[PDB]
Write an enzyme that holds these catalytic residues in place. Structure first.
Site, PDB file in Angstrom:
ATOM      1  N   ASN A 132     -27.302  24.999 -42.162  1.00 19.25           N
ATOM      2  CA  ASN A 132     -26.239  24.376 -42.934  1.00 19.25           C
ATOM      3  C   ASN A 132     -26.910  23.669 -44.088  1.00 19.25           C
ATOM      4  OD1 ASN A 132     -23.428  23.154 -43.256  1.00 19.25           O
ATOM      5  ND2 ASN A 132     -24.735  21.323 -43.176  1.00 19.25           N
ATOM      6  N   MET A 167     -16.422  24.030 -44.653  1.00 17.10           N
ATOM      7  CA  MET A 167     -15.917  22.711 -44.301  1.00 17.10           C
ATOM      8  C   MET A 167     -15.254  22.624 -42.926  1.00 17.10           C
ATOM      9  SD  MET A 167     -17.171  21.501 -46.876  1.00 17.10           S
ATOM     10  CE  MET A 167     -16.712  19.883 -47.532  1.00 17.10           C
ATOM     11  N   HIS A 203     -26.447  20.423 -46.712  1.00 18.10           N
ATOM     12  CA  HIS A 203     -25.666  19.196 -46.870  1.00 18.10           C
ATOM     13  C   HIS A 203     -26.160  18.530 -48.142  1.00 18.10           C
ATOM     14  CE1 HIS A 203     -22.915  16.121 -45.477  1.00 18.10           C
ATOM     15  NE2 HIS A 203     -23.797  15.210 -45.851  1.00 18.10           N
ATOM     16  N   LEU A 206     -28.203  22.186 -58.013  1.00 19.43           N
ATOM     17  CA  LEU A 206     -29.359  22.890 -58.551  1.00 19.43           C
ATOM     18  C   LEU A 206     -30.493  22.887 -57.537  1.00 19.43           C
ATOM     19  CD1 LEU A 206     -28.442  23.967 -61.069  1.00 19.43           C
ATOM     20  CD2 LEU A 206     -29.506  22.062 -62.314  1.00 19.43           C
ATOM     21  N   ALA A 207     -30.656  21.760 -56.853  1.00 22.43           N
ATOM     22  CA  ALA A 207     -31.681  21.625 -55.828  1.00 22.43           C
ATOM     23  C   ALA A 207     -31.309  22.465 -54.594  1.00 22.43           C
ATOM     24  CB  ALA A 207     -31.829  20.169 -55.451  1.00 22.43           C
ATOM     25  N   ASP A 242     -25.794  14.963 -35.720  1.00 24.69           N
ATOM     26  CA  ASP A 242     -26.828  13.959 -35.963  1.00 24.69           C
ATOM     27  C   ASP A 242     -28.225  14.366 -35.512  1.00 24.69           C
ATOM     28  OD1 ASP A 242     -24.516  12.335 -36.689  1.00 24.69           O
ATOM     29  OD2 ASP A 242     -25.781  10.582 -36.312  1.00 24.69           O
TER      30      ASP A 242
END
Ligand SMILES: NCC(=O)N[C@@H]1O[C@H](COP(=O)([O-])[O-])[C@@H](O)[C@H]1O
Length: 201
Positions: A107, A90, A109, A172-173, A145
């Site tokens: 990363n 974080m 997200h 889970l994904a 971005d």
């Protein structure tokens, strides 16, 4: 074997999934160090119970991002790290650090970027009222971005969902695509071209 460092701030479920996939027969990478900016988090135990060395680099003990990231960078160099995976980390990295690790830092997200950027993506999704969310793994770029996207998995939002239930379904994904993305990148199948756009074999 590509040497990987996983940066975390909490639980470590994603760290765990990466450990398992890296401990798989055909993996092209191995996790050589786990760094947390917070001491006493469960992810630390998972790295330990796995025989993976750890370091706690507390951002609160520094003056700015540059100083904090320099300490982190000292450890990565110390472990000849090749790929950096931000798994629940974080902290916003300083530009020079992101620059240094361009094309080598991934990363994860918990949304389908560009939707719901920032913290609390699940809460944002539920406030908004979407019926489809998901997770995204991408290369970290100067601005949060333009991060080049590597893989994404759509996940349905049930009408009853609370932050807890959705959050669980999305993780889970995440455990599916972070390992796959790491492998993709570690093996060289995916790279950041000279134009800065993703590239496949
Ligand atoms: N700032 C990015 C962010 O929101 N990341 C998300 O935080 C969770 C930590 O999971 P974990 O510690 O159990 O892997 C994960 O669901 C990850 O996608």
């Amino acid at each position: 074997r590509i040497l990987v460092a996983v940066l975390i701030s909490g639980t470590g479920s994603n760290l765990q999934a990466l450990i398992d996939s890296t401990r798989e027969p055909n993996s092209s990478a191995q996790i050589d160090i786990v760094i947390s900016n917070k001491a006493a988090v469960a992810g630390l135990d998972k790295a330990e119970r796995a025989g993976i060395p750890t370091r706690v680099i507390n951002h609160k003990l520094y003056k700015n991002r540059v100083e904090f990231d320099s300490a982190i960078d000292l450890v990565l160099e110390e472990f000849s790290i090749d790929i950096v995976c931000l798994a629940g980390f974080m902290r916003i990295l300083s530009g020079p650090f992101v620059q240094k690790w361009n094309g080598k830092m991934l990363n994860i997200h918990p949304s389908l970027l560009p939707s719901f950027k920032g913290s609390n993506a699940h809460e944002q999704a539920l406030e908004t009222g979407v019926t489809v969310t998901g997770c995204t793994v991408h290369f970290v770029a100067e601005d949060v971005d333009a991060g080049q996207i590597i893989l994404q998995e759509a996940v349905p939002v049930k009408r009853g969902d609370t932050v807890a239930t959705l959050s669980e379904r999305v993780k889970l994904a995440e455990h599916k695509i972070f390992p796959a993305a790491l492998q993709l990148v570690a093996s060289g199948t995916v790279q950041l071209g000279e134009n800065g756009k993703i590239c496949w074999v």
